[PDB]
Design a protein around this nucleic acid. Sequence first.
RNA 1: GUGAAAUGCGCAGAUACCGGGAGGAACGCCGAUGGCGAAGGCAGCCACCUGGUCCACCCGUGACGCUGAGGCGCGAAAGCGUGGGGAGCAAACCGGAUUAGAUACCCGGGUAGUCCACGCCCUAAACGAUGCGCGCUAGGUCUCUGGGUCUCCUGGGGGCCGAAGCU
Lengths: 101, 119, 271, 88, 70
Amino acid sequence: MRRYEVNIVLNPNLDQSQLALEKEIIQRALENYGARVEKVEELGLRRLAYPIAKDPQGYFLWYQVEMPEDRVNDLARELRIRDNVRRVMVVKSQEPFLANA
Amino acid sequence: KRQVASGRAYIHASYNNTIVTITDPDGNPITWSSGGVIGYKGSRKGTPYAAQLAALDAAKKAMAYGMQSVDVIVRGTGAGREQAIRALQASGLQVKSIVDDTPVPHNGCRPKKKFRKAS
Amino acid sequence: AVKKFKPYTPSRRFMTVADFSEITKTEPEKSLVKPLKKTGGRNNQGRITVRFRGGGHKRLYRIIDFKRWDKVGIPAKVAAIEYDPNRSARIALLHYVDGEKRYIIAPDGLQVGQQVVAGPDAPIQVGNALPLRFIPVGTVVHAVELEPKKGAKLARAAGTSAQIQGREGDYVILRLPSGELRKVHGECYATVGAVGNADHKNIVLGKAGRSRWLGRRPHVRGAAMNPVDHPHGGGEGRAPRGRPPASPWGWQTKGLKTRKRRKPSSRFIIA
Amino acid sequence: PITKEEKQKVIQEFARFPGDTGSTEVQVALLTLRINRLSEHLKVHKKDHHSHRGLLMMVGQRRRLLRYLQREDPERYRALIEKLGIRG
Amino acid sequence: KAKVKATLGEFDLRDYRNVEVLKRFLSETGKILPRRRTGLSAKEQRILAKTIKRARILGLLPFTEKLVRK
RNA sequence: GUGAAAUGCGCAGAUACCGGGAGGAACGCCGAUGGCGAAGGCAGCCACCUGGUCCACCCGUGACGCUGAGGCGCGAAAGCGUGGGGAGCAAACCGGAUUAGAUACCCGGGUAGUCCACGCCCUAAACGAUGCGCGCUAGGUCUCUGGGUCUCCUGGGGGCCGAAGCU
């Protein structure tokens, strides 16, 4: 297993219920592809540099996880099916590297 | 008929000719002019003096439909580009601001041969 | 994959046949649902009205399912991929949990053992069928109804697909295998994926029998007949039509559009 | 990749005397493992010519060595090859 | 005038989510800035840009902004 | 649009502006006299598979080495075969210009091709015009990348100036 930082951007204009569904589906998804949830930081709605999907806002989710390397590509695909999930980004985790060290 | 005092004006200055199109606050044109719209025709249309004459002839029409302040927005290098701005500030329009939005690829599609002189 | 043969005979030099990896482990068709005897017959009440049809291997018909909304919510396992003489695509026999069995025109990717299911609920994956509204804009998809509840009409030729292009009210924009762009109703079902057996285009028939085996009789050129017989007919020794090419019936056949002008199908089409 | 463990197990499994990390016999079994793992890879990515180069470089090494091994010792030359499955 | 590395504290040029930290490395044209201005090292200016890019793709940073009064 | 033009497009509503959509190619800034690769060559971001390389620790094998006729593989672009794609660009091809002439140079179009896959082709100012491995023979200067009880010392790589010597 390798460590990975998941990024997922959801519709801004969502009732917290649908937003929960989507986020509950993401748990199944994480779960099924062999992902042990580590951290998780919900910085929530944020203003965007450029409009995504006609919207200048977006709802963000970071996620530390540990999972098997192989299935990750698939998870990213399975996370993208959804109409509401507008962006996904996997990233192998490697510990902060500091300037003015 | 329709009038608005607060609008917006776009400057297209090509290495050939300069043409100004004045709009509403969301970009729907009200009137325009250019180096062709004056008595000039050919490569004199690219001259800055013509870009001026246009810019004035352009402004002068917008006033008539109530115009007073406009935001200015340029696209593209060209002799007449500067004289264009200049010609609007001192003209009876309040140049509320300027922007440059000359479009420019992030290494897009291959340009013609004349332009691909940059190896 | 397309088998090519060594030239131990002319003709068998150009001939190529299908791989049958496709289908393996199931040939005799399903006595149960599968068969109605199929009726060979190259015309209506007396007169031939499609020229050059006849002969060709005696053939049994497999009764497929083109309306999957019967079995909404019931999943089925894909039990086998088998050969269908009656169309270019191959077919998959699938046993519903229901007990009940049926044949679907087998989409690409589909493999024995998979489970497959139809409904608004269904996962957006291979072989599953869904209203067009609940299918994500961009996916390719085949065996598409054209009006809701009327049966799958589009995209069933071997290796065909359509692509969801956009939404628009109760309707939904579709790029067809032709290249046409057509609104189709949201409730019109369609099965995710494309069709498969897509090497089908590349069979090289190989000789002129074979063409006969598939029941295609020889086709005699226009000029090649006499004037009674055809517009091009006639001319002392060999001839150059003599303006402008025409069917036996006379109507022009180079470029002349034939679709009906005031068709209410219009307004729905755009290419 | 080839893990720490898979690596070690091979090594402790082919040693001459625990601790022996080099040695003809082991060096070989390292490559063999890398090779097959690599062999297996190029079989999918046929178009990966660059990585194919390395294989040919190892293949030599393996050879190079085996010829030494055989020259000094016919006895544990059979041992290795047979308890490892090569000679094509 | 202002060297930008010196004008911050300890900061992790690996975090493609410190908009505030990163924002300052982006002209008023949205470009990546040179070492003539960041004053990062070779090695730094790299591990920098790669994260700046990502962050653009996440929707945090602009790829470009148009140029206010010129 | 040019040198100035003309062909060409446009009152059948173009150019200029705004919104909504389609599609293909190439990845601005970072980016450099920078890096990687045996060569050809390799540049948006992500993940997976995988090659070569460098430093340190002095632990193991114990000369297991260097080169390599022939063989075998790779080999830019163009070009070929089958099928897909085709926005931009563009041999051929056509129009306008110029000119004595203009099968060119400049302008308006434009077909292969450019791209994908799969298989061929095997060339080149394939150039450092400098085969590979090793040992030996002043230093100065700036740079990439590692290791140090880090004004510096040490190892690997990329440029410039130059001892001896060679020419």
